[PDB]
Write an enzyme that holds these catalytic residues in place. Structure first.
Site, short mmCIF file in Angstrom:
data_model
loop_
_atom_site.label_atom_id
_atom_site.label_comp_id
_atom_site.label_asym_id
_atom_site.label_seq_id
_atom_site.Cartn_x
_atom_site.Cartn_y
_atom_site.Cartn_z
CB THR A 28 17.10 4.61 -97.74
OG1 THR A 28 17.74 3.36 -98.44
CG2 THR A 28 17.65 4.39 -96.17
CG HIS A 514 20.49 -5.33 -86.84
ND1 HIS A 514 20.50 -4.65 -85.57
CD2 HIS A 514 19.48 -5.94 -87.05
CE1 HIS A 514 19.42 -4.98 -85.34
NE2 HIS A 514 18.78 -5.67 -86.13
C1 LIG Z 1 14.59 -9.91 -90.03
C2 LIG Z 1 14.98 -8.70 -89.77
C3 LIG Z 1 14.60 -7.84 -88.67
C4 LIG Z 1 14.71 -6.39 -88.56
N1 LIG Z 1 14.16 -5.87 -87.02
C5 LIG Z 1 14.19 -4.60 -87.10
C6 LIG Z 1 13.64 -3.99 -85.93
O1 LIG Z 1 13.00 -4.47 -85.17
N2 LIG Z 1 13.83 -2.46 -85.74
C7 LIG Z 1 14.74 -1.86 -86.83
O2 LIG Z 1 14.79 -0.69 -86.49
N3 LIG Z 1 15.14 -2.35 -87.92
C8 LIG Z 1 15.05 -3.77 -87.97
N4 LIG Z 1 15.53 -4.31 -89.25
C9 LIG Z 1 16.38 -3.61 -90.04
C10 LIG Z 1 15.75 -2.39 -91.21
O3 LIG Z 1 14.60 -3.14 -91.64
C11 LIG Z 1 16.81 -2.32 -92.15
O4 LIG Z 1 17.72 -2.00 -91.72
C12 LIG Z 1 16.27 -1.40 -93.22
O5 LIG Z 1 14.87 -1.82 -93.84
C13 LIG Z 1 17.33 -1.27 -94.36
O6 LIG Z 1 16.80 -0.25 -95.04
P1 LIG Z 1 17.52 0.01 -96.84
O7 LIG Z 1 16.85 1.03 -97.40
O8 LIG Z 1 18.96 -0.04 -96.46
O9 LIG Z 1 17.07 -1.55 -97.46
P2 LIG Z 1 15.97 -2.52 -97.58
O10 LIG Z 1 14.85 -1.88 -96.65
O11 LIG Z 1 16.47 -3.57 -97.29
O12 LIG Z 1 15.24 -2.22 -98.79
C14 LIG Z 1 16.32 -2.75 -100.16
C15 LIG Z 1 15.28 -2.89 -101.19
O13 LIG Z 1 15.99 -3.07 -102.34
C16 LIG Z 1 15.39 -3.97 -103.13
N5 LIG Z 1 16.72 -4.80 -104.08
C17 LIG Z 1 17.29 -5.58 -103.83
N6 LIG Z 1 18.07 -5.79 -104.74
C18 LIG Z 1 17.60 -5.09 -105.93
C19 LIG Z 1 18.14 -4.79 -107.10
N7 LIG Z 1 19.26 -5.32 -107.62
N8 LIG Z 1 17.27 -3.90 -107.93
C20 LIG Z 1 16.11 -3.38 -107.31
N9 LIG Z 1 15.75 -3.43 -106.10
C21 LIG Z 1 16.63 -4.30 -105.27
C22 LIG Z 1 14.81 -5.06 -102.07
O14 LIG Z 1 13.78 -5.97 -102.54
C23 LIG Z 1 14.35 -4.17 -100.98
O15 LIG Z 1 12.95 -3.90 -101.07
C24 LIG Z 1 15.38 -5.67 -89.38
C25 LIG Z 1 15.87 -6.48 -90.71
C26 LIG Z 1 15.68 -7.64 -90.86
C27 LIG Z 1 15.85 -8.34 -92.00
#
Ligand SMILES: Cc1cc2nc3c(=O)[nH]c(=O)nc-3n(C[C@H](O)[C@H](O)[C@H](O)COP(=O)(O)OP(=O)(O)OC[C@H]3O[C@@H](n4cnc5c(N)ncnc54)[C@H](O)[C@@H]3O)c2cc1C
Ligand SMILES: *[C@@H]1O[C@H](CO)[C@@H](O[C@@H]2O[C@H](CO)[C@@H](O[C@@H]3O[C@H](CO)[C@@H](O)[C@H](O[C@H]4O[C@H](CO)[C@@H](O)[C@H](O)[C@@H]4O[C@H]4O[C@H](CO)[C@@H](O)[C@H](O)[C@@H]4O)[C@@H]3O)[C@H](O)[C@H]2NC(C)=O)[C@H](O)[C@H]1NC(C)=O
Ligand SMILES: *[C@@H]1O[C@H](CO)[C@@H](O)[C@H](O)[C@H]1NC(C)=O
Ligand SMILES: *[C@@H]1O[C@H](CO)[C@@H](O)[C@H](O)[C@H]1NC(C)=O
Ligand SMILES: *[C@@H]1O[C@H](CO)[C@@H](O)[C@H](O)[C@H]1NC(C)=O
Ligand SMILES: [Cl-]
Length: 581
Positions: A28, A514
């Site tokens: 995101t 998830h």
């Molecule tokens: C093992 C696994 C398998 C998955 N398989 C699938 C799938 O097959 N299909 C699907 O649709 N989804 C899947 N997902 C889920 C999907 O990848 C996540 O729901 C999605 O990436 C979450 O997006 P986000 O922006 O909320 O967080 P994220 O993408 O996790 O990004 C958050 C970011 O914040 C960074 N961060 C953390 N703490 C801090 C801090 N204090 N300061 C600065 N940066 C920080 C992290 O390093 C990371 O890069 C899977 C997830 C995992 C873990």
């Protein structure tokens, strides 16, 4: 090159001001950074704890290498509390690097049921957040490729009306180059014998039955991680800056005005050597569902009962960190005959009655009569604070199940040499929490407790679904390829009944990773943390835009929805940018 453009020195932004600061360069965060910087007048600084990993090699770029990256520096591996279900600590795989968890995920690309997203508007009071609108944004984000003859012959079905072909995220069929295993179609036949549908396009709004699906990869099979899709094409934008290797610790707040205002963030890697950077417009938290809520708590936004004992002054009191919803996953794996050789994945999105079988009546009786008791129990465990509001979530799930027959469990099949199912109850009733345990953000000392299996229907549903995977692996057309079970194998009698499975599952499961809901997007009165524009209640210029905000789980893989969510919030941010000139 992109590597050369990344900032690593804190002094490069310390004390400076940009229009928007995004904490977390994940799915995101990077989608939002790309959308906001389309306007050259808008300066954005993304602060990410990890770094660029998209060009590392197969461990990141090949979806078939899934899992190899676990335990490395690209995996945060957040540890849970000692779980009450089994007295063990579990690890939450979560990507650490530009692209976040899209760097380490399974690449599965599917959407939820129309009624689930519609309820975000009708039950959770989020105006404009319904299937039609979210799906439109999802198609906008998507750049899908239809399957070719080989892929169609394997079992793929693609309804062009349900996919964007002009978007940003490259998605298409995984194809390693070898023959597709006939086991995928064998599974379809096995469920067809039971009256279950097959080949529905899981991106159309009614994910049910057994189908294959697109994956987030380019035609050359390179993983379509969020940094490769949203940052790599745009890194030369002067107004887009990315600082790697640093953690955002907390949001800087000014309380000199009427309402607290987010004016910037403090970042660093250790107490005593931190730096501040300021935002003229807003601070946007996108550090992931396990972390954004902690950033709020470290900032003084959260529950007084949590913050006061840690020495943190409560600036805005909100139920931050509650309502955590993650699924439980278990495995059934069997040997196959050489006739079953070949590549291929598929999944059975199984309804409540398909999951429970002849235990359906009894499971429905629990669903009908125990909602208030379950809500009281979850609140007493600290998974939520308002019983009536939690009961509303539970009745919403009941409505999904009884009035819309949404998928209740997912049985995910991998072949490539075996017949292996990872199985999860998609709609857990348990509610957990995440709370900081220290005032220092850089100590990363927190209590992350999903409360897996602390709700009885979640245990029964998981047990029933996993038992079903064993059943279908040796049912109908699948019998031909069956060459003996290896997991549970000797660990659970092959003819085990439902009760036996419920006793086995707590000791043989893993988190599904998830997790959502820790900064739920729903009215404050329902226990929400952010409004329908993702703005934190009671604070100006602060939003949470990541997996922390969905108020419910969904019957799908979440990327299709999270990309849409980021684009929708980006538009809301841009509308306010125009109102703040
Ligand atoms: C093992 C696994 C398998 C998955 N398989 C699938 C799938 O097959 N299909 C699907 O649709 N989804 C899947 N997902 C889920 C999907 O990848 C996540 O729901 C999605 O990436 C979450 O997006 P986000 O922006 O909320 O967080 P994220 O993408 O996790 O990004 C958050 C970011 O914040 C960074 N961060 C953390 N703490 C801090 C801090 N204090 N300061 C600065 N940066 C920080 C992290 O390093 C990371 O890069 C899977 C997830 C995992 C873990
Ligand atoms: C996770 O770990 C926690 C601990 O950290 C577990 O919680 C504890 O669980 C134990 C039981 O395993 C429980 O201890 C009992 O407390 C009772 C009082 O509330 C006692 O009455 C009971 O004593 C009986 O059993 C003992 C152990 O065998 C005997 O030494 C004792 O003499 C008693 O024996 C009678 O009862 C037994 C049947 O139990 C019978 O066979 C005998 O003939 C005799 O009649 C226990 O001491 C703790 O109270 C729990 N809590 C804590 C904080 O310690 C938790 O269960 C674990 N979870 C998982 C999933 O493993
Ligand atoms: C394809 O999807 C559209 C939109 O959901 C629908 O109207 C149409 O009936 C679908 N076609 C098939 C063959 O399922
Ligand atoms: C599921 O089973 C219950 C109990 O038998 C029944 O009342 C309900 O209508 C069933 N739903 C479906 C979709 O078959
Ligand atoms: C608890 O939740 C219910 C249902 O959303 C709501 O009506 C009520 O106002 C909430 N209670 C408080 C004290 O806010
Ligand atoms: Cl491509």
């Amino acid at each position: 090159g992109i590597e050369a453009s990344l900032l690593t020195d804190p002094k490069d932004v310390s004390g400076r001001t940009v229009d928007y600061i995004i904490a977390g360069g994940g799915l995101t965060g990077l989608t939002t950074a790309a959308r906001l910087t389309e306007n050259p007048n808008i300066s954005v600084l993304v602060i990410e704890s990890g770094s660029y990993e998209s060009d590392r090699g197969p461990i990141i770029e090949d979806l078939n290498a899934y899992g190899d990256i676990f335990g490395s520096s690209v995996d945060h591996a957040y540890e849970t509390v000692e779980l009450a279900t089994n007295n063990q600590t579990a690890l939450i795989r979560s990507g650490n690097g530009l692209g976040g968890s899209t760097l380490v995920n399974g690449g599965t690309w599917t959407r939820p049921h129309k009624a689930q997203v519609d309820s975000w508007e009708t039950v959770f009071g989020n105006e404009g957040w319904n299937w039609d609108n979210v799906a439109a944004y999802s198609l906008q984000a998507e750049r899908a490729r239809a399957p070719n003859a080989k892929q169609i012959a394997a079992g793929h079905y693609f309804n062009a009306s349900c996919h964007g072909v002009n978007g940003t995220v490259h998605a298409g069929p995984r194809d390693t180059g070898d023959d597709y295993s006939p086991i995928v179609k064998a599974l379809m036949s096995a469920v067809e014998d039971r009256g279950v549908p097959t080949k529905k396009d899981f991106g159309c709004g009614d994910p049910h039955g057994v189908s294959m699906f697109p994956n987030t990869l380019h035609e050359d099979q390179v993983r379509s991680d969020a940094a490769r899709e949203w940052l790599l094409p745009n890194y030369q934008r002067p107004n887009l800056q990315v600082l790697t290797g640093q953690y955002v610790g907390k949001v800087l707040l000014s309380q000199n005005g009427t309402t607290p205002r987010a004016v910037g963030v403090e970042f660093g890697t250790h107490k005593g050597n931190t730096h501040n950077v300021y935002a003229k417009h807003e601070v946007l938290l996108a550090a992931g569902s396990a972390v954004s809520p902690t950033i709020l708590e470290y900032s003084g936004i959260g529950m007084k009962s949590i913050l006061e004992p840690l020495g943190i002054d409560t600036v805005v009191d909100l139920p931050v960190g509650l309502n955590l919803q993650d699924q439980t996953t278990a495995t059934v794996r069997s040997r196959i005959t050489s006739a079953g050789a070949g590549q291929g994945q598929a999944a059975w999105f199984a309804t409540f009655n398909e999951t429970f079988g002849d235990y359906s009546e009894k499971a429905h009786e629990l669903l009908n009569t125990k909602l208030e008791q379950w809500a009281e129990e979850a609140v007493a465990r600290g998974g939520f604070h308002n019983t009536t509001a939690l009961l509303i979530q539970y009745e919403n799930y009941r409505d999904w199940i009884v009035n819309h027959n949404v998928a209740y469990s997912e049985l995910f099949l991998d072949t490539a040499g075996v017949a292996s199912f990872d199985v999860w109850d998609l709609l857990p009733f348990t509610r957990g929490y995440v709370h900081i345990l220290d005032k220092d953000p850089y100590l990363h000392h927190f209590a992350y407790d999903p409360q897996y299996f602390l709700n009885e229907l979640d245990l029964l549903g998981q047990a029933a679904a996993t038992q079903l995977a064993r059943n279908i692996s040796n049912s109908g057309a699948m019998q031909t390829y069956f060459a003996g079970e290896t997991i549970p194998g000797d660990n659970l009698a092959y003819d085990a009944d439902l009760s036996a499975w419920t006793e086995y599952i707590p000791y043989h499961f893993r988190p599904n990773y998830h997790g959502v809901g820790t900064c739920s997007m729903m009215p404050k009165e329902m226990g929400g943390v952010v409004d329908n524009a993702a703005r934190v209640y009671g604070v100006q210029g602060l939003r949470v835009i990541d997996g922390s905000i969905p108020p419910t789980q969904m019957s799908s893989h979440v990327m299709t929805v999270f990309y849409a969510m980021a684009l929708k919030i980006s538009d809301a941010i841009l509308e306010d940018y125009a109102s703040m000139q």
